[PDB]
Design a protein around this ligand. Structure first.
Ligand SMILES: NC(=[NH2+])NCCC[C@H](N)C(=O)O
Ligand SMILES: O=C(O)CCC(=O)C(=O)O
Ligand SMILES: [Fe+3]
Length: 333
């Protein structure tokens, strides 16, 4: 598409008539374009800009310091440019991943649950900026999930019943400038949870793939059907033009599975630009222990254990990271 649809969400979603009309409109936009925008208010906008500023300041730190912000208990922390792999090929942003920030005193960490541990924060100002941002993003994700259930004529809490203490996380990204021979930022892929809410500066680089009539889509939660790299050099790829005062929203793997493909996990990719590009991707996820189920295929026994999918995905992102080594050595998976 050449112009994405932009919506205003209400502060509370109760199931009123306007809620149902909006929820249906959001679903139709996903089914046509693969993505839509939501307007941010003054607080959401500010929190977004504060997160971007903290990201830029952190990236100015020496590489030796950034590399120390790592954990062997959680995937939270720093990812160097070229460390992450998508379809076996290195992605080139530097990243700070924020997963659920759990103390070593948390019962799940004491029990050795995979991926559970405290964030290796660079400092407390950075910590406050990202946690405040993710609180705001979580409120938007809960609204979007209630509206999605209403748009499908499902009980309003269908999806939010799966996101109590949800495994929400965020990737804080800086993409370096391109060269004459290299412009790959992140390869084509689909994300893993229910929703992706994303924000970006004014530089530009994100492309998404809308649903395509007659195009079968891999089911990225299954062994031999990874979505990484698929369609990477074939049209259509919609450029997500930087637009002031909005976040973008598209579905992840769990929504595709639960809706039987009536929604599709939106494939997307990032190209390096002539300038460095800052972006934040937020993932509104089920509880780590939640089992997603088919909504429209009754008598279906299939399930996705979300925590298993997250753990499998991040191990494939970072096969050599100390986090992955400890999972392997201690057979946490
Ligand atoms: N942790 C992520 N969400 N990474 C997004 C990029 C795709 C990821 N490297 C993959 O192979 O699936
Ligand atoms: O750079 C972006 O806008 C999104 C990056 C992304 O897809 C991701 O981190 O999952
Ligand atoms: Fe992504």
């Amino acid at each position: 598409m050449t112009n994405l649809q932009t919506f205003e969400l209400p502060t509370e979603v109760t199931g009123c008539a306007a809620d149902i009309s909006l929820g249906r409109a959001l679903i139709q936009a996903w089914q046509k374009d693969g993505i839509f925008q939501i307007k941010t208010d003054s607080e959401q906008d500010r929190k977004t800009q504060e997160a971007m500023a903290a990201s830029k300041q952190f990236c100015k730190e020496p590489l030796t310091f950034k590399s120390s912000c790592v954990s062997d208990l959680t995937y939270s922390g720093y990812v160097a440019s070229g460390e992450e792999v998508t379809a076996g090929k290195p992605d080139f942003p530097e990243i700070f991943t924020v997963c659920k920030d759990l103390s070593v005193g948390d019962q799940r960490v004491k029990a050795g649950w995979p991926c559970h541990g405290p964030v290796p924060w660079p400092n407390n100002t950075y910590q406050k900026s990202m946690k405040t941002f993710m609180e705001e993003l979580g409120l938007a994700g809960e609204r979007l999930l209630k509206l999605t259930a209403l748009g499908f004529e499902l009980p309003i809490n269908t999806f939010t019943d799966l996101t109590r203490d949800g495994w929400h996380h965020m990737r804080v990204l800086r993409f370096p400038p391109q060269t004459s021979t290299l412009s790959r930022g992140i390869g084509a892929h689909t994300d893993y949870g229910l929703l992706v809410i994303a924000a970006q500066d004014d530089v530009g680089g994100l492309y998404i793939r809308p649903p395509v009539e007659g195009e079968k889509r891999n089911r990225n939660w299954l062994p031999g059907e990874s979505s990484a790299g698929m369609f990477e050099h074939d049209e259509p790829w919609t450029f997500v033009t930087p637009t002031p005062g909005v976040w973008t929203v598209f579905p992840g793997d769990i929504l595709q599975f639960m809706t039987g493909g009536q929604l599709l996990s939106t494939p997307h990719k990032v190209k390096l630009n002539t300038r460095e590009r800052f972006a934040c991707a937020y993932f509104h996820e089920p509880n780590f222990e939640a089992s997603a189920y088919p909504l429209f295929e009754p008598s279906a026994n299939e399930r996705i254990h979300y925590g298993e999918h997250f753990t499998n995905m991040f191990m494939r992102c970072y096969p050599d990271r100390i986090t992955t080594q400890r999972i392997n050595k201690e057979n946490r998976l």
